[PDB]
């Protein structure tokens, strides 16, 4: 009894108090602001929702019996908060928290408000240990939310519901089927994108793609023809994961040129927060695909504390691939195949042999000028000299090297191509970035004039000084 | 104070990287720390070293001696308050902040120094404070400290000649520059071989000579070499007592490549275990070797590689693979043919090289400025 | 010793002598300006990112 009298009492009052201005005041201001004005995003308090989600994530009977049927009930809500606090201080409070929104005069008269209120129970119920709020009961609460979803008037409800049917997906993600979630999402997508433009063409796309790939079906038809590619309103958080998904989709189909740029943009759109969960994966792929595309080094050495422990296999891998040796590649694959399979990346790196052999032959071509093929096999350990002829021939085909070969003799001789400065390519190289440096100036200037505003102050010299000047001039002209 | 303590830091490193070296250093460092009341550098180092169970008596008596000294110092503070000159409290606290630094941690010494910097009205004592900060930063490798203190010293040194102080700053800046892999800057700032006193950071003038010749091997080419480091008798007379470095330099100058490699191996072995050269001791080596090749290939044009075996080191395949991996890197412009075992040379113009670095530095700066562009404006 | 630039042939003893254009002033100024603006951009952190 003595132990629980000094640290247990504090938990009750202080969190309630600091919540009274965190979500109670937030709800009160949103009701008269989001549902009281057309500021939308401004008075929608999506960042207040954000903060009250992130803080409560790492953080109900009183707040569920909120009443606002009449003005006295709405006024009462706030004194009833203190009344329930006093009851909690004196007495011990408590399914029976789902019928209250239909009772206790609960007439918010704003869907934007009752939605967030309902979702707030769902988030704790989702995070109620691993119980899943008695499983389907959380889903049933979200089934209630889905009934609310069909309620209507979306000058706020839309951007309120986004988060709702984003956690809704997580509910099934942690449990049972997802196929019928896909059916629902497909329907909901055209339920939107038809009410002119309403957004959600960002969140629903990511929700659909999150486990479309996880089920391991690489359908792409609708992605190339999707009209929701361009919501243009993503808060710079949705856009990153959307670009990541489309980049992996593009890269898995033997397309490397565009995936690098799009997914590098996606990675560099990532925020500054300490969490590095998805950045681990995007980095890992962003350097596998760069190894695949030609032989760009990618070895922009990463030793940051967060990423150091994870990417230890990959460092060893790049070490083998950069050199022309091939036994090292097998000695790495047979060692880390299971680890790569656990990462879902065995299929991409299993086709890396061609890149290794291209690097080796290019290095051999650049180093020597006249070498017998009776040693190329020994240096690259192909175990046979005759097929080295075919390998070199294929290399010459694609313009890898311009060396000729005397088949009757056996030695390979290479041409000499120097003085690239006179070639037209450096002009192209300069132009490609002249374009960028000209674009950035216009981009910067475009947004400079937005902050200058409220400059109504426009006065020249005076108002009544003109009469004094005229009088002085007349007096001077009189004499 | 921190005049003798530099070597202690060396020993710390000598017990970190050398695993086999764990016998004598742990003892000489130990009884160097037991005196002088050095309490700081073995809070965690005691964990790094052996358990050393028998220390609680020593720990207690040593920390109580520390407390006795500190309370004495407070006594003189209050004594100086009533009958003060230039606030002799501040004179005493400046005079004993170095004691606290010698015994305690960074926080107390740094705070005491930053507070006592305001009592001194003359430039000399300000410079002494700044030099104390440079020294502690060199101990604990605090880069921003080094940079800010160096720029403050340079902004304080133009008022008045202080050419001895200027030379001291030059030596400090050279020491910082060797730690970073900037070598040309070191060789330029290590041309103070006629103004280096028997300083407190390099016990040996001869060690200073060895460092400057080592960096001058890389930084500068043949005319300057042949003009400055071989025609300045002030270092020739010192080198007369150092046969190893003398023959090491003469081997490179006189093209006796056979004796060059043993000396190079000895030098790199010695500098592997030396401080402020280990972190990149391999890099250095991989320069000299390639440099030697560039000292021989430009005189001739069709030299056979067999000549290397009896002129540079036995082993045809070794030279073959070495030259191959050096050609692949983009340096040492030449070419080799295996069917007839011949080595040809070429003369690329000094334009293409003057182009690649331009394009790549432009790329990196453009990337950086794009990051700046998007990080601002939401 | 760079006093005389050419090339020596060991096969028969022919001293090929050639000359090269003056090393251009074109690019070292570009190089220094690039590093100078890099330093300016780096110094721009202390007033751009910290304040915003």
């Amino acid at each position: 009894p003595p132990g629980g009298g000094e640290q247990e009492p504090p938990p009750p009052p202080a969190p309630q108090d600091v919540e009274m201005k965190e979500e109670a005041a937030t709800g009160g201001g949103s009701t008269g602001e989001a549902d009281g004005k057309t500021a939308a995003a401004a008075a929608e308090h999506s960042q207040r929702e954000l903060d009250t989600v992130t803080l409560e994530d790492i953080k109900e009977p009183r707040f569920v019996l909120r009443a606002l049927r009449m003005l006295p009930s709405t006024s009462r809500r706030l004194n009833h908060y203190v009344l329930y606090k006093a009851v909690q201080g004196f007495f011990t409070s408590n399914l029976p928290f789902l019928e209250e929104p239909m009772d206790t005069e609960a007439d918010l008269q704003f869907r934007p408000r009752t939605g967030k209120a309902a979702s707030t129970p769902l988030l704790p119920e989702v995070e109620a240990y691993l119980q899943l709020l008695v499983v389907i009961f959380m889903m049933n609460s979200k089934r209630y939310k889905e009934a609310q979803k069909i309620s209507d008037n979306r000058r706020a409800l839309d951007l309120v519901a986004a988060k709702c049917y984003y956690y809704h997906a997580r509910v099934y993600e942690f449990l049972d089927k997802l196929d019928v979630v896909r059916s629902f999402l497909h329907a909901r997508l055209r339920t939107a994108t038809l009410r002119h433009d309403a957004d959600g063409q960002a969140t629903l796309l990511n929700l659909l793609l999150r486990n479309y790939l996880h089920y391991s079906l690489y359908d792409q038809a609708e992605k190339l023809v999707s009209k929701s590619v361009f919501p243009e309103q993503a808060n710079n958080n949705e856009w990153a994961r959307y670009l990541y998904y489309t980049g992996r989709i593009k890269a898995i189909q033997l397309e490397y040129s565009e995936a690098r740029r799009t997914m590098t943009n996606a990675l560099r759109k990532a925020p500054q927060h300490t969490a590095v969960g998805f950045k681990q994966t995007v980095h890992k792929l962003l350097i596998v695909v760069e190894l695949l595309l030609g032989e760009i080094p990618d070895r922009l050495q990463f030793r940051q504390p967060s990423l150091k422990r994870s990417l230890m296999p990959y460092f060893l891998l790049t070490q083998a691939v950069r050199t022309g040796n091939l036994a090292k590649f097998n000695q790495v694959l047979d060692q880390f195949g299971e680890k790569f399979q656990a990462d879902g990346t065995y299929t991409l790196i299993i086709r890396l042999r061609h890149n290794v052999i291209k690097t080796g032959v290019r290095m051999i071509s650049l180093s020597y000028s006249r070498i017998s093929l009776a040693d190329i096999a020994q240096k690259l350990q192909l175990d046979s000299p005759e097929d080295a002829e075919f390998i070199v021939a294929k290399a010459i085909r694609d313009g890898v090297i311009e060396a000729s070969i005397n088949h009757e003799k056996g030695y390979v001789q290479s041409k000499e191509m120097i003085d690239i400065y006179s070639t037209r390519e450096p002009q192209l190289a300069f132009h490609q970035r002249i374009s960028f440096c000209l674009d950035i100036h216009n981009m910067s200037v475009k947004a400079m004039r937005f902050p200058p505003k409220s400059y109504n102050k426009d006065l020249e010299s005076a108002e009544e000084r003109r009469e004094r000047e005229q009088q002085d001039l007349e007096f001077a002209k009189e004499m | 104070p921190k005049n003798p303590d530099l070597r202690i830091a060396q020993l710390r490193f000598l017990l970190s990287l050398p695993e086999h070296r764990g016998d004598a250093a742990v003892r000489d460092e130990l009884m160097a720390a037991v005196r002088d009341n050095n309490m700081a550098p073995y809070y965690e180092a005691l964990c790094k070293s052996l358990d050393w169970q028998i220390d609680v008596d020593l720990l207690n008596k040593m920390k109580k001696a520390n407390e006795d000294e500190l309370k004495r110092l407070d006594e003189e503070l209050e004594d100086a308050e009533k009958n003060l000159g230039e606030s002799e409290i501040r004179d005493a606290m400046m005079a004993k902040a170095e004691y606290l630094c010698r015994i305690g941690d960074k926080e107390g010494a740094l705070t005491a120094f930053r507070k006592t910097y305001d009592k001194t009205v003359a430039l000399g004592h300000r410079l002494d404070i700044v030099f104390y900060l440079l020294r502690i930063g060199l101990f604990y490798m605090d880069n921003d400290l080094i940079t800010r203190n160096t720029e403050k010293a340079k902004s304080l040194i133009e008022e008045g000649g202080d050419w001895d102080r200027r030379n001291r700053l030059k030596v400090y800046q050279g020491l910082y520059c060797v730690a970073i892999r900037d070598f040309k800057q070191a060789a330029e700032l290590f041309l103070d071989t006629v103004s280096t006193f028997t300083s407190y950071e390099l016990m040996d003038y001869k060690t200073f000579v060895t460092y400057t010749v080592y960096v001058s091997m890389i930084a500068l080419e043949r005319p300057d070499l042949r003009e400055k480091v071989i025609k300045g008798a002030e270092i020739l007379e010192v080198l007369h007592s150092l046969p190893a470095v003398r023959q090491y330099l003469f081997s490179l100058y006189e093209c006796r490549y056979s004796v060059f490699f043993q000396s190079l191996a000895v030098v790199e072995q010695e500098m592997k275990k030396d401080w402020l050269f280990a972190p990149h001791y391999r890099y250095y080596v991989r320069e000299m070797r390639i440099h030697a090749y560039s000292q021989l290939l430009e005189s001739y044009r069709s030299l056979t590689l067999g000549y290397m075996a009896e002129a540079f080191g036995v082993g045809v395949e070794f030279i073959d693979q070495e030259l191959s991996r050096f050609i692949a890197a983009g340096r040492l412009h030449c070419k080799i043919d295996k069917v007839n075992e011949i080595v040809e040379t070429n003369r690329p113009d000094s334009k293409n090289w003057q182009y690649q670095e331009t394009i790549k530095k432009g790329d990196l700066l453009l990337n950086r400025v794009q990051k700046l562009s998007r990080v601002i404006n939401m | 010793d760079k006093k005389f630039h050419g090339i020596l042939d060991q096969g028969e003893g022919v001293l090929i002598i050639f000359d090269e254009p003056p090393v251009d002033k074109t690019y070292e100024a570009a190089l220094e300006t690039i590093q100078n603006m890099s330093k300016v951009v780096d110094s721009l952190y202390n007033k751009a990112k910290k304040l915003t």
Partner: peptide, 30 residues
């Protein structure tokens, strides 16, 4: 190339100045 680079960085500095000259003044109206 070089000139366009310099032009861009100067315009960037100008934008930074404008924005900080706004966010530290707009708050004065409460």
């Amino acid at each position: 190339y070089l000139a366009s680079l310099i032009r861009s960085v100067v315009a960037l500095h100008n934008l930074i100045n404008n924005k900080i000259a706004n966010r530290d003044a707009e708050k004065k109206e409460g």
